[PDB]
Amino acid sequence: GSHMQMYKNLDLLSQLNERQERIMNEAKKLEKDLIDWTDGIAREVQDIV
Known about the structure:
Layout (H helix, E strand, L loop, with lengths): L1 H9 L2 H36 L1
PDB class: endocytosis
Keywords: endocytosis, early endosome
Assembly: monomeric
């Protein structure tokens, strides 16, 4: 009845939380790639200069 409807809706959090964890993972990835890019370019430019 009303309670099961309520529980099914509360349970949609599962999918939303999956998405939140994906986006957080992609932000961490991006941060690490930006750092590694910057460090890698600096080493290369130092090699040139």
